[PDB]
Design a protein around this ligand. Structure first.
Ligand SMILES: Nc1ncnc2c1ncn2[C@@H]1O[C@H](COP(=O)(O)OP(=O)(O)OP(=O)(O)O)[C@@H](O)[C@H]1O
Ligand SMILES: Nc1ncnc2c1ncn2[C@@H]1O[C@H](COP(=O)(O)OP(=O)(O)O)[C@@H](O)[C@H]1O
Ligand SMILES: Nc1ncnc2c1ncn2[C@@H]1O[C@H](COP(=O)(O)OP(=O)(O)O)[C@@H](O)[C@H]1O
Ligand SMILES: [Mg+2]
Ligand SMILES: [Mg+2]
Lengths: 48, 517, 464, 468, 49
């Protein structure tokens, strides 16, 4: 019974960690797109 | 036995009929040049996308038109361009020759042969930018296009006129799937009936020449060069050629399609074409966007891929089926070009490196792969046998976590686990070996009717193959019935079941066990 | 007074006009490509005033074959689409041209596609519920009249049948009409929708406007406004309830981003256009209830990278009033419509709006379904018998509830001879209240499949 | 009829010429730096015609000391390097000057370094195995004789050590000619290679062309072309098998990107030049074997920041018959060579070419390693004791297999003090067949670390207290 | 570069030199600032090519 309870808790914690990591990964993905666009546009403006 | 008579006659006909009467020509001057882009003053009446001639027989395409000059993408031998050179306008937008003579030939994006087999007799010419069939010029995609790959033909079936994306990381088996499809079209070709024949166009963009040669050798070994054309834009070609190669292949396929033929065109691969177009746009100083791509890259791919259509009966009923290939990086299907092409196509086959390393070949991820045409592109027999495959595989993937706890699992869960393992083994297929629709139907029938339940997983593949051999040698009437009627009749089904049971009596598991009952 | 093409850069065209004849912003200009192969009439949309009598425009059609210096004619007004009852039953593009019958509607009244939303004082200050007649939607995810409903669902989940059902219900129950806006429409899918609507006999009640994938970004940007203008005419001049379908709104956003990039604008976060929110607001605020009539919209929404915080879905969801998620899991069970009762949601499922009894019944249904979903794993692996007796009771009740959310749809009559059913909201509320209490747990499961209210339930129970 | 310097900015120089005297693209021009400390003759490669009789060029030498308005002379031709049997046994720079014997080779035939690739009809797929004696390479990434081989990896994962190992194993007993191209790499490494080849007696059969990372971007752009021109002469004229070594080919792309923005090109994604794929395609398509003329090329490809999705390695991947991908994770685990068995690939690793046994054993090894990679996180968190018995068996087998893929290399002795070893292909296949069946499961995993064949395994196991 | 020249003078006279750069990231930032002020087009992280 204790193992069942502990494994349910571990699965819930893993789900929460997955959610948080996905949020952080999406933030990083958006930031990478924004920074890449920033560098590209800066180069274009410099060559303008 | 080469007689000089033919050479003399040809050259005499050339010289005698040679006339170069002067014609008024609009001419500009190269005002600057750099890395494949030439800016040319003059040519006031030049058209957008017009073809221009530079000295030494160099070709350019006018893309940027402004008051000061014209920006032109040089299609080759750019190092020959110089400031001050005279540029003539051809008065024609990009166009390519088209005809039946292109079958079995390797050409460059301009239709010029590069295989060294001589001239190509062109039936006519097609502009690369002719509009796609209109919304009211089409009919629903209903005819199957059998790739010969069980995973695709059962899970994500492709119909004639469909655009099915093949997307995945490098070395995941995409070119293999496309080449298998082209090879599978050989029996249909041998039928000789234009309603069944499929003409194949393989467009190679950015591949190294030896890779294109290997693909051509693979096609020849299977006899696919008889009905296949290759449009090649190797890595050494100018960015303009890489940008135009898909359109050249599409134009040839469109000439065939509008004449009532059915065409299969493979773009290997559109990511390289997008990169070449991005290079051209950046060199022309066009504004960049995400990933530095221009604002019309989605337009590029969408206009390319909407020419693949199933024409209405009024227009001859022809069709062109698109198999664009996309190379993802680290399986990032969220990248810009993969996102665009996924949004454009009617279905996706996602190939994965982890599946490939696990031995699942072709490494198609059935969970995420989809075909929006769906069962409309399947024959009745495949629809019947393959109905339960999707749910069975989903349940198997759900239950895989309990592989070692089969004893704890109830009867239904263990049965589902075993069935899913056997089905996954069934969907595996060796390279360069497409299967006829009847053989695929029989194999899926084995999988989904429980006839592999008694067979060990490690033997399933072998079993299937041997069984398919046995029938083909002794009970071909089953295959003939499936092929002619496109359905599995009850009498045929019971005969197949009896044959399966006898063969099981005859079959040997690799571990010395018995597969009977 | 006619202009001339000066610069051509893909779909971006610069046009020079005489000093005192510069067109207004968003005016439609006409140019001619006379090359035989690509001969056509380009429609340019004035995007910027560059100064010195120069304007920058987005070509609605590919500019291949266009020559510098060709005459450009100003039409004096922005892109205008035909309006009236004549547009029903026909297919148009973003420019108002009829695709199934070229020249049709060229004489109708023409409305500019750029219009302001209703005046702030003319807006309805109180939200209202759109009684569709479908049990699942009415009970769990009620649709807001004059609101926005996101639609989620893969292939083979009944989305097309759901759209046909909504067309039927707006045409029959509300006496309204429907405008379908295919943004970034695949030509194959557009043709399929055309033929399907013609077969189902609902084409007569629908006006189709297609901005296809193979068109430059400008038409894909403006097709939504075109369809919205047709719907606005139906609402304001004909005094009709209108149901506007947008598919896909994300493709409208992406076309806007492409246009912004083409015009040289500096991209905003994640590469979207700086005016993403402004464009989305301009489009969405025109979909409202006003003067007793309303335009209700059901829009397919694509979420990039499944990232709901992405700027495109984030801006889109600032205007959505309800969400309907179609799940293949529900579809495989035979429950139609295949609406996922747990993933779907509505912002007006609040006692202050739908009433206390409605909210209580809906919450009870959601709780039962959630507990059933939780017990699903144990059922699947350990077996049903492994569960307790209360768990078995709740499993039976939840199975009956989930099968009762299925309905016999009007659009489904074309597949099965049986016609559709319209369950009044009060009947649905009381029926599901009784069901949650376990007053029908003894009935067979099949008795709850594809039926209307309680009378149909009893009739099918006697049949078994 | 001579030009004059107008603008100078880093390695890019603008030169104005009279009417009708604008040099053709890629032409080599000469300018003088007269400052005593930095006095020299700049070689400038014409890169662009800017209009108004102006040309933008890349300086092959540092432009420090260059003065505006100095005379610029046009040679009328591209950069040309000496060719012939005389280049063997000598060290050259990107411009064809002989470093170890200045003035040598000035009378040889000279070939322009800019050249079109072989015609497509002349191309011929190569499907012949090139046995190396390295277990991982021979088993999972078999190299192709006459094909294109690359070693991918991040900084300091063993690309250069493996290049030297393959020089030791392949070039030592090679009948034909060898060409080594040091492209934007360490001068110390170049000197070490020169001395090592001299001591091994391989130098007499080798032509070395060095453009080091201290050189300006133009030299790093053109040194690969120079070495490839020598190799192309050997392939097409002398008609003998050629071994071509390039380290590091990524430096060509990097120098191109370095000068791109100064050439006025709007940057592409990740800061690379818009023409990355086209230039790389030209250079790589020149590096190939034609029908009857074999070039076995081995290239070290640097992967920036260990990011295999970076556009440079991603574009390079398409140009290789075989790729051995070195992993930082494998390196940090102490496994040498740090080959990633799951990421590497070879086009000749199919049953038709290598045979059913080799293919089956390699696929089984890959499957076991993939499963172990899948289970690593679970082992890290919950421990091995929570795995099924079959999974425990697979984990032990996979650890032994991954250790056995490591090998003591001839070129690695300087780093470990252990002499290298060579394993025949048959022995490798047999040993990994035995491993995949669990026949060595009783031996400790440490017994499989940095050894050769099965005899070495038995000896090390005995030294560790176990019997094979 | 000043430190390198000072060390090189000894190195070419048969001496053994040890040079410590503490630290090169700051020099890279200073060079980037100089290049940006001169309006040379930027690259990755706005660094010069
Ligand atoms: N069904 C299969 N069974 C076994 N091996 C296969 C199968 N399909 C492909 N392969 C092998 O997988 C490797 C990759 O195949 P392929 O070149 O077709 O992939 P790709 O994704 O197109 O590659 P690339 O990135 O080089 O373009 C090759 O060795 C091919 O032989
Ligand atoms: N209520 C229903 N009754 C009968 N069949 C249905 C019902 N809903 C959906 N279907 C079937 O499911 C399929 C769903 O396809 P479609 O309507 O195009 O939606 P999607 O685009 O999600 O596949 C249809 O072919 C239809 O026959
Ligand atoms: N086979 C090996 N055995 C032991 N150490 C090695 C081996 N290969 C590489 N190393 C270590 O890793 C370092 C990096 O190798 P090298 O190839 O010179 O760098 P890069 O991988 O950047 O080219 C070497 O200096 C050496 O110390
Ligand atoms: Mg491929
Ligand atoms: Mg190195």
């Amino acid at each position: 019974a204790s193992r069942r309870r502990a494994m349910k808790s571990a699965t819930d914690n893993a789900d929460d960690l997955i959610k948080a990591l996905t949020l952080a990964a999406n933030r990083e993905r958006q930031a990478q797109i924004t920074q890449e666009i920033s560098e590209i546009v800066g180069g274009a403006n410099a060559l303008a | 036995t080469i007689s000089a008579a033919d050479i003399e006659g040809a050259i005499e006909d050339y010289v005698s009929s040679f006339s170069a009467d002067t014609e008024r020509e609009e001419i500009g001057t190269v005002i600057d040049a750099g890395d494949g882009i030439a800016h040319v003053e003059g040519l006031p009446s030049v058209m957008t996308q017009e073809l221009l001639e530079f000295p030494g027989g160099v070709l350019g395409v006018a893309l940027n038109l402004d008051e000061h000059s014209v920006g032109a993408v040089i299609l080759g031998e750019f190092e020959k361009i110089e400031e001050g050179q005279q540029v003539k306008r051809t008065g024609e937008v990009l166009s390519v020759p088209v005809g039946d003579a292109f079958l079995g030939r390797v050409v460059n994006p301009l239709g010029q042969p590069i295989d060294g087999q001589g001239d190509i007799a062109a039936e006519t010419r097609r502009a690369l930018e002719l509009q796609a069939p209109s919304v009211v010029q089409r009919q629903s995609v209903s005819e199957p296009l059998q790739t010969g790959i069980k995973a695709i033909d059962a899970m994500t079936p492709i119909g004639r006129g469909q655009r099915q994306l093949i997307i995945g990381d490098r070395k995941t088996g995409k070119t293999a799937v496309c080449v298998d499809t082209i090879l599978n079209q050989r029996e249909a070709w041998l039928t000789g009936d234009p309603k069944q024949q499929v003409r194949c166009v393989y467009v190679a963009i950015g591949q190294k020449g030896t890779t294109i040669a290997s693909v051509k050798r693979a096609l020849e070994e299977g006899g696919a060069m008889e009905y296949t054309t290759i449009v090649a834009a190797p890595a050494s070609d100018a960015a303009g050629f890489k940008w135009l190669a898909p359109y050249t292949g599409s134009a040839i396929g469109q000439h065939w399609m509008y004449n009532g033929k059915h065409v299969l065109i493979v773009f290997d691969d559109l990511s390289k074409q997008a990169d070449a177009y991005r290079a051209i746009s950046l060199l022309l100083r066009r504004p960049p966007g995400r990933e530095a791509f221009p604002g019309d890259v989605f337009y590029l791919h969408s206009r390319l891929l909407e020419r693949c259509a199933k024409l209405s009966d009024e227009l001859g009923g022809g069709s062109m089926t698109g198999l664009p290939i996309i190379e993802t990086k680290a399986n990032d299907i969220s990248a810009f070009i993969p996102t665009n092409v996924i949004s454009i196509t009617d279905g996706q086959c996602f190939l994965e490196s982890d599946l490939f390393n696990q031995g699942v070949r072709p490494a198609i991820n059935v969970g995420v792969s989809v075909s929006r045409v769906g069962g409309a592109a399947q024959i009745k027999a495949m629809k019947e046998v393959a109905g339960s495959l999707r749910l069975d595989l989903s349940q198997y993937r759900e239950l895989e976590a309990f592989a070692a706890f089969a004893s704890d699992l109830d009867a239904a869960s263990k049965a589902q686990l075993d069935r899913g393992a056997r089905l996954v083994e069934l969907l595996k297929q060796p390279q360069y070996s497409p299967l006829a629709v009847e053989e695929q139907v029989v194999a899926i029938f084995l999988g989904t009717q429980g006839h592999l339940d008694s067979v060990p997983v490690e033997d399933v593949q072998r079993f299937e193959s041997e069984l398919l051999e046995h029938v083909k040698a002794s009970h071909s009437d089953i295959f003939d019935g499936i092929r002619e009627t496109k359905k599995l009749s009850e009498e045929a089904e019971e005969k197949l079941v009896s044959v399966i049971n006898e063969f099981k009596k005859g079959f040997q598991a690799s571990d010395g066990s018995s597969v009977v009952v | 007074t006619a202009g001339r093409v000066v610069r051509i850069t893909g779909p971006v065209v610069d046009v020079e006009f005489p000093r005192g004849s510069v067109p207004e912003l968003f005016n439609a200009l006409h140019a001619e490509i006379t090359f035989g192969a690509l001969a056509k009439t380009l429609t340019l949309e004035v995007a910027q005033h560059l100064g010195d009598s120069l304007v920058r425009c987005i070509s609605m059609q590919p500019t291949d074959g266009l020559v510098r210096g060709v005459e450009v004619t100003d039409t004096g007004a922005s892109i205008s689409v035909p309006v009236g009852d004549g547009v029903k039953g026909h297919v148009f593009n973003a420019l108002g041209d009829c695709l199934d019958d070229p020249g049709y509607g060229k004489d109708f009244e023409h409305w500019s596609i750029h219009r302001k939303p209703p005046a702030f004082s003319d807006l309805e200050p109180r939200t209202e519920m759109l009684e569709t007649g479908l049990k699942v939607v009415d009970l769990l995810t009620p649709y807001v009249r004059g609101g926005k409903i996101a639609l989620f669902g893969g292939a083979g989940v009944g989305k097309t049948v759901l759209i046909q059902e909504m067309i039927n219900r707006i045409a029959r129950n509300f006496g309204g009409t429907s405008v379908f806006a295919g943004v970034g429409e695949r030509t194959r899918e557009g043709n399929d929708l055309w033929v399907e609507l013609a077969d189902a006999n609902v084409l007569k009640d629908t006006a189709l406007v297609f901005g296809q994938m193979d068109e430059p970004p400008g038409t894909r940007m403006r097709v939504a406004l075109s369809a919205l203008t047709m719907a606005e005419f139906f609402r304001d001049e004909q005094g009709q309830d209108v149901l506007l379908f947008i598919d896909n709104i994300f493709r409208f956003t992406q076309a806007g981003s492409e246009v912004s990039t083409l015009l040289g604008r500096m991209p905003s976060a994640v590469g979207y256009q700086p005016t993403l929110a402004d464009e989305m607001g301009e489009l969405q605020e025109r979909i409202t209830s006003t003067r007793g009539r309303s335009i209700t919209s059901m829009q397919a929404v694509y979420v990039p990278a499944d990232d709901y915080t992405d700027p495109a879905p984030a801006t889109t969801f600032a205007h959505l009033d309800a969400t309907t998620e179609l799940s293949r899991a529900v579809f495989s069970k035979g429950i139609f419509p295949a609406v996922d009762p747990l993933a779907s949601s509505s912002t007006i499922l609040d006692p202050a709006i739908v009433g206390d009894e409605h909210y209580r019944v809906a919450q009870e249904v959601i709780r039962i379904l959630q507990r059933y979903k939780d017990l699903q794993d144990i059922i699947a692996i350990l077996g049903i018998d492994e569960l307790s007796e209360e768990d078995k009771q709740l499993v039976n009740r939840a199975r009956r509830i989930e099968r009762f959310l299925s309905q016999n749809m009007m659009a489904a009559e074309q597949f099965t001879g049986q016609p559709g059913s319209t369950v009044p909201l009060k009947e649905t509320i009381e029926a599901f209240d009784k069901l949650t209490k376990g007053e029908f747990d003894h009935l067979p499961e099949q008795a709850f499949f594809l039926i209307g209210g309680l009378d149909d339930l009893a009739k099918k129970a006697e049949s078994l």
